Design a protein around this ligand. Sequence first.
Ligand SMILES: Cn1c2c(c(=S)n(C)c1=O)N[C@H](SCCN1CCOCC1)N2
Length: 500
Amino acid sequence: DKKWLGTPIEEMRRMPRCGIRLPLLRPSANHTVTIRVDLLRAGEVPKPFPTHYKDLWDNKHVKMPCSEQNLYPVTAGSRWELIQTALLNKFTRPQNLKDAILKYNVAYSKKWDFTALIDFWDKVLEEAEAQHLYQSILPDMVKIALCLPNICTQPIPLLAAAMNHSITMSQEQIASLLANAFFCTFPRRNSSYPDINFNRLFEGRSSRKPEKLKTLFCYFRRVTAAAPTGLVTFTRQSLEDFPEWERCEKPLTRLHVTYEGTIEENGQGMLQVDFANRFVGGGVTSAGLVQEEIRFLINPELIISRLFTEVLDHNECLIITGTEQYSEYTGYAETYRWSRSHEDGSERDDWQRRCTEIVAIDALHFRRYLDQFVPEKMRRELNKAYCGFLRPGVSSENLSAVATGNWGCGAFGGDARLKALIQILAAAAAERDVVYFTFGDSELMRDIYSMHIFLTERKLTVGDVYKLLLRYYNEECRNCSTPGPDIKLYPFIYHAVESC
Ligand SMILES: Cn1c2c(c(=S)n(C)c1=O)N[C@H](SCCN1CCOCC1)N2
């Protein structure tokens, strides 16, 4: 019968109910704000700040395609003018769009294949849908792209390694930027930053790509038909000091665990985990289609993090507040399908951000299964998850539950039961409750619940549990001569505590 165990999800903290009173929104040395805060009003499109376009072309800011420094060989010409001339042409066939995009990407005319785009337009879409694409949706996308200098007036700093910095920008500004990424307009982006131009979406034979395309066009149709009115914050967070895990005296927090539901639907208002690549977004603009890529497609405002977010080091994460859901889907990887348009019902905070908080924390890839039991590797994951969960200067009463699942399992070779306990410990250290979705695995739900209530009823601390993990490594893994150990982790823990 039972679909969930533990503390009722109803009893877990959610935004906006649990939220702090936000301080007044204002630009500072660690907070770039690209709109007029004095004109920010519910239901109104934000006004860019500053009024006129200002340009920075350097190694600390986004290089905007509309910069006067974006040049091409003719003598130097303005590539932004070239871009306008190429994209301001009628499209009636997919070749026309390929040819347009290549005019200002000439070096790539033999490298970039547009097969997935051609197949999408010709062999996937209905003729009426193809007609709406080229008569309406693509021209509306060109227009919002070419409007970039009036929209995105303020230089956008890169979220570089080791920076603790926030960018708050309008959903409209994002739309402009992402329309540019679709048309592959971002200069010098074709090494420690993810891809942002969408050229790899158009390439290859793949049945994923039509579905990706449908998801993104669903977004593009919405935001070019009627401007979104809210804001989005992107915060790179980088911690210097990490807990001494073996000395940590904090108790475990509450747990709800279920084999039904999703982070995104059932974890509304909670800190939602993105099972990230260290290049945020992973394969979203290319071949990937699992948990991160899906989330970046149905909430495409996440994709713009790729424009400005340097690859995550071990002590870093990216926290994104206010992205909106535009699509629903079914399946994943080979069975992923775009279903329909989604009307996001989320409330907005006092900064006009959707009450949706997503954190990108990248797990390690374990080519050898036992490697993740090595203390250094356990600590690495604990500290990554901890950095992703901690909100310095906020009381625990005001922190939502963490909504997560089988982080780093799948292609990355994580043990689900180890990673569950890791996330439980990190959450406990950050003084947050845990809502854990096992994604159909009822046995995993029962196991995580059983271990959690076992440790809770015996009042073991974070440190107590971590020490038991070290004992597991020292007795069962270290001098282990086979691919897996003699005894599994949870049984080992039960026997070791029940032995005391
Ligand atoms: C929406 N969603 C969701 C997943 C999870 S685990 N949860 C909790 C969730 O809410 N996986 C996916 S697709 C990739 C499947 N692999 C399953 C094993 O783990 C790694 C990844 N989508």
